Design a protein around this ligand. Structure first.
Ligand SMILES: [Ca+2]
Ligand SMILES: [Ca+2]
Ligand SMILES: [Ca+2]
Lengths: 143, 212, 224, 286, 286
């Protein structure tokens, strides 16, 4: 019993495009063309004890979406920086907050755009204020 | 009176004024009822934090709250007809502020001093580090501190010469081999993290002098 | 009357497994706001308080999806009236205590609007709450969400006057959040439209202020 | 460093007509008022390497630009020297505009909301809504300011040109004349001012030096004469009262014939002393 | 704008000994080299309001500083006028240093990795690792440069003070003497240089205009004796060669008498003609 973001594999897209899929490029995360490879698939698991979600890459199931000390989202081993508190603002559309306060504020996934173009942009972690910032909106779609 | 338990989380980020509850008197069919609130947070300092719609009973909060400044508000609601006469006795309403884990644990000192005998047996209590957390002790784990040892200088003659109780902060000798002549001074970086060690963290130094 | 009885006081969460109207007796351990519904919000329930029986909220309308948001006190007895349906699939009543924004919806029935087309007129007829009582409507604006695309929404009634409160809903693991969109909508013959985001979810709370008809008729008209 | 205790106005690159305006503790983007409610003192902290932006309101002397975390709103609060009241002034060379970043959190910078006419915090972008113009208040008040110039001795009279056919400069009564009004303009490279008479497309207030002492308006020969450029300096404890010196020789100042308060007296350059005849009421034409 | 097509060096505020260094497409942090390997031309695009940072490599002339998005990696690639090859130059007025932000993503700025000795990226913060010192390469090369000065006629001879008590200046074979070395210090206000001989603490290279073309070393207790100051201008298509002209009279260049590459020839000023006896090699002394 849980209708809110059930466990399983998802594709992660930005709200700016329906054809760009999240995947690790080098040590960064970016949205690229569909590849049908395991690296564009993400296992979303609920952590009941800490009341959050952890998201791992299918190609590397031991690496989770996290963040470094430079404001970038990263793929690394499990830690409290891998703990996300999703806010569902529409059908399959979420804002991804870090569970813990970062710099004494709510921080969220953030993809920069140039007139709705997000090619070659890295996914970042930036302050969040509300549910109206498109750059902090992402679609998680099974399966 | 028809009033439920009322609460609002600290650090609301906007969308003010935010609706909390529409309170009412079930005598509202008899005459037109006018609502109002009194107390600290309403008409008394801090004034205007909470407001109510006079004709509908919509209770609202006008600004972000902070549980560590004020954890609960004590207001009184008033129901009154057009001629000023009360249709209900004034009702006490408590508004609790729900905690967020927004306070980092804080060690009492940047550097704690301690001393240990040269040939002490493992299990020997040495010293005690201690931190505090301002968040809600009662209802959450946001102030549940877990103490750990991050590093040890030097890493000799072993990596784990000492151990710390994660609940108390008390540091005890772990392994034998404390030699005053070769390694007289030890510097441990101790960590203090809330949410039972999974939340916000901080570090301090535990300087330990080995002696005769 | 075939009163079935919940053994012990409900905590925060509970699930009670079940062609004729019968009643379910229960108490709650903690006084507070509760969401009560069937699966999946079928059928619509009614809830009563045992005076010491008084109606609280909810309607009896066939094939109509809804749930109840109600303030339950720990030192009182309550009755859920489940009406006759169709004996195809087993049913169950779900109980959840709500400490969040759902507080803004007591004591109201929340209608589930799940048949909104791209554009056009829509109306939903329910039994009207008494004067100063509440009926609510949870609906999703048609189309894909992109935080940009928008439809025009006219909300109004036909006979009864009411004060509308419009919220946008977001959901976390802790439940619904309610965000203020529009207050004090005078619903009777309302010609004012509001632009709402496609794919976004909204809840309209309606307080009846003039009982001119047995049925309240909420209209949702959508233009480009 | 070089901007410490400098009183400045702050306007929007997204709309150069909107200035930071402090009213009842609020901060809005408002039209140019040329008063102290749009003036801000920059107070530097050597340790933070950041600035407080304090309002020059005379009735409320301790209000500073403040970020109301955790919301994204901007207002003024009492100065408590807090991190959310400090700012990084980042100058975009080329534009000569500033990005004003929060010291508490440099991820966020000032953002001009031209619809709500206020300020909010935002993450960075390439737009002009986060670019701002910081100018010394005297310069911003005087630059492109079509004004009328009255000697403080008589406020009903005005420094004017006779007419379009007589470029001589005289003192006379005020009557909404195009020869009575002047447009002050500021040249950045020369750091000096020019007084364009509005009855001419490019006529400039000039001390002719071929003649000994003579003030006549003359055509604008660019990068030519420095007697066509001036330096304006304010007078203490006075709202709109200034002194005007020349650029060619800074020892000579604009002067009504000492001390003749007549309706036909000349306007001449004269050695700088500072009596009531060498000071000017630079007002806005009503 | 004001820095368009200027050739600069770029060093770190965190470590002022580390400079932007380029070779074969790779960008790193290295010690001061005083050559083209650490020289960059800032190229301004009016419409983008951003700059390209182009390496002054003499073998590959079209390499500009590039962010290899979306990675953390910075390098020099062939110029294609790409968005990831443009940069916002933001001067922190608070501490006179520069933040270099990507035009493709203004949230990301250059971060100095002083351990790996290269560049990565970071969101804005208050750390000195994202602050950089931009400076004209001539000033950067010459300021605080303890050096040796040799005539291009004979690169084994050095300009020197004869001894500690002989304030005359002649020519002699290089022999590691403290009197054979000079500390070049740049004066911002006078836009000039002084040559402090390393056998005292106030003796600068000066033109004794009281006695013809005599050049000697004298005390610098008078700040404003313009004969103490000099202008060091680079010779076209040379690596370390300069002409040195006096500030009291710029038509006077530092001159080796003759002609002569002898071991006692006089150092003097003479009317600038530009021959080999007025060209000088400023080098780092072994
Ligand atoms: Ca707090
Ligand atoms: Ca805490
Ligand atoms: Ca707290």
């Amino acid at each position: 019993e849980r209708t809110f973001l059930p466990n399983g594999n998802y594709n992660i897209k930005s709200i700016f495009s329906g054809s760009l899929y999240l995947n690790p490029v080098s040590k960064s995360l970016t949205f690229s063309n569909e590849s049908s490879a395991n690296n564009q698939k993400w296992n979303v698991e609920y952590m009941a004890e800490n009341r959050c979600f952890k998201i791992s890459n299918v190609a590397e199931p031991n690496k989770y979406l996290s963040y470094d000390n430079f404001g970038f989202i990263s793929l690394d081993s499990l830690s409290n920086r891998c703990y996300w508190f999703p806010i569902k603002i529409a059908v399959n559309t979420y804002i991804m907050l870090s569970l813990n306060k970062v710099n004494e504020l709510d921080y969220a996934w953030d993809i920069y755009d140039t007139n709705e173009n997000i090619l070659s942009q890295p996914l970042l972690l930036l302050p969040n204020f509300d549910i109206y910032n498109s750059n902090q909106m992402f679609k998680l779609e099974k399966i | 009176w028809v009033i439920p338990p009322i609460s609002c989380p600290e650090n609301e980020k906007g969308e003010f004024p935010k609706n909390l509850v529409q309170i009412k008197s079930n005598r509202d069919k008899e005459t037109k009822v006018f609502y109002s609130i009194t107390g600290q947070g309403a008409d008394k300092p801090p004034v205007g934090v909470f407001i109510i719609e006079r004709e509908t009973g919509w209770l609202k909060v006008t600004q972000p709250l902070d549980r560590e400044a004020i954890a609960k508000y004590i207001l009184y609601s008033h129901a009154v007809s057009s001629n000023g006469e009360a249709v209900e006795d004034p009702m006490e309403i408590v508004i609790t502020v729900t905690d967020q884990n927004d306070n980092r644990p804080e060690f009492t000192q940047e550097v704690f001093e301690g001393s240990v005998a040269e040939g002490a047996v493992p299990g020997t209590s040495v010293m005690k580090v201690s931190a505090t957390d301002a968040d809600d002790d009662v209802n959450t784990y946001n102030a549940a501190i877990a103490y750990t040892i991050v590093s040890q200088d030097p890493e000799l003659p072993h990596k784990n010469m000492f151990t710390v109780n994660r609940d108390t902060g008390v540091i005890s000798v772990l392994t034998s081999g404390l030699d005053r002549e070769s390694y007289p001074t030890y510097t441990l970086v101790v960590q203090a993290a809330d949410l039972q060690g999974e939340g916000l963290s901080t570090t301090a130094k535990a300087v330990i002098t080995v002696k005769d | 009357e075939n009163i079935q009885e919940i053994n012990t006081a409900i905590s925060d969460n509970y699930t009670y497994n079940i062609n004729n109207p019968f009643y379910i007796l229960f108490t709650v351990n903690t006084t507070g706001i509760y969401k009560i519904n069937a699966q999946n919000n079928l059928p619509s329930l009614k809830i009563y308080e045992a005076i010491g029986i008084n109606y609280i909220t909810g309607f009896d309308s066939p094939n109509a999806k809804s749930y109840l948001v109600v303030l339950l006190n720990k030192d009182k007895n309550y009755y859920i009236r489940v009406p006759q349906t169709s004996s195809n699939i087993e049913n169950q009543i779900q109980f959840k205590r709500e400490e969040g924004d759902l507080r803004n919806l007591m004591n109201s029935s929340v209608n589930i609007i799940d048949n909104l087309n791209s554009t056009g007129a829509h109306y939903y007829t329910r039994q009207s709450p008494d004067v100063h009582d509440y009926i609510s409507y949870e609906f999703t604006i048609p189309g894909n969400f992109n935080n940009k695309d928008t439809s025009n929404i006219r909300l109004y009634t036909s006979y009864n006057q009411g004060i509308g409160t419009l919220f946008r809903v977001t959901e976390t693991i802790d439940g619904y959040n309610l965000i203020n969109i529009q207050q004090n909508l005078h619903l009777l013959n309302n010609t004012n439209s509001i632009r709402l985001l496609n794919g976004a979810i909204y809840i309209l709370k309606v307080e009846v202020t003039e009982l001119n008809n047995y049925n309240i008729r909420l209209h949702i008209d959508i233009t480009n | 460093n070089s901007l410490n205790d400098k009183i400045v106005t702050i306007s929007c690159k997204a709309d150069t007509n909107l200035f930071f305006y402090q009213v009842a503790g609020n901060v809005s983007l408002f039209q140019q008022t040329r008063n102290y409610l749009e003036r801000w003192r920059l107070i530097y902290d050597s340790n933070k390497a950041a600035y407080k932006i304090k309002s020059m309101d005379i009735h409320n002397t301790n209000l500073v630009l403040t970020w109301n975390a955790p919301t994204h709103n901007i207002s003024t609060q009492q100065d408590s020297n807090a991190d959310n009241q400090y700012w990084l002034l980042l100058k975009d060379i080329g534009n000569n505009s500033f990005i004003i970043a929060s010291y508490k959190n440099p991820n966020l910078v000032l953002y001009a909301d031209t619809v709500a006419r206020n300020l909010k915090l935002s993450t960075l972008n390439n737009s002009n809504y986060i670019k701002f113009i910081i100018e010394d208040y005297i310069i911003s008040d005087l630059n492109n300011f079509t004004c009328k110039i009255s000697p403080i001795l008589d406020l009903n009279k005005v420094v004017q040109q006779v007419d379009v056919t007589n470029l001589n400069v005289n003192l006379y009564t005020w009557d909404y004349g195009r020869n009575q009004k002047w447009t002050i303009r500021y040249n950045e490279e020369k750091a000096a001012y020019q007084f364009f008479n509005t009855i001419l497309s490019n006529g400039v207030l000039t001390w002719i030096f071929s003649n000994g002492n003579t003030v006549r308006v003359s055509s604008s020969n660019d990068q030519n004469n420095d007697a066509q450029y001036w330096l304006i300096n304010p007078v203490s404890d006075t709202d709109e009262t200034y002194t005007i010196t020349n650029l060619r020789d800074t020892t000579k100042a604009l002067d009504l014939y000492g001390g003749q308060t007549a309706n036909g007296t000349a306007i001449q350059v004269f050695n700088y002393h500072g009596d009531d005849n060498q000071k000017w009421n630079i007002r806005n034409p009503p």
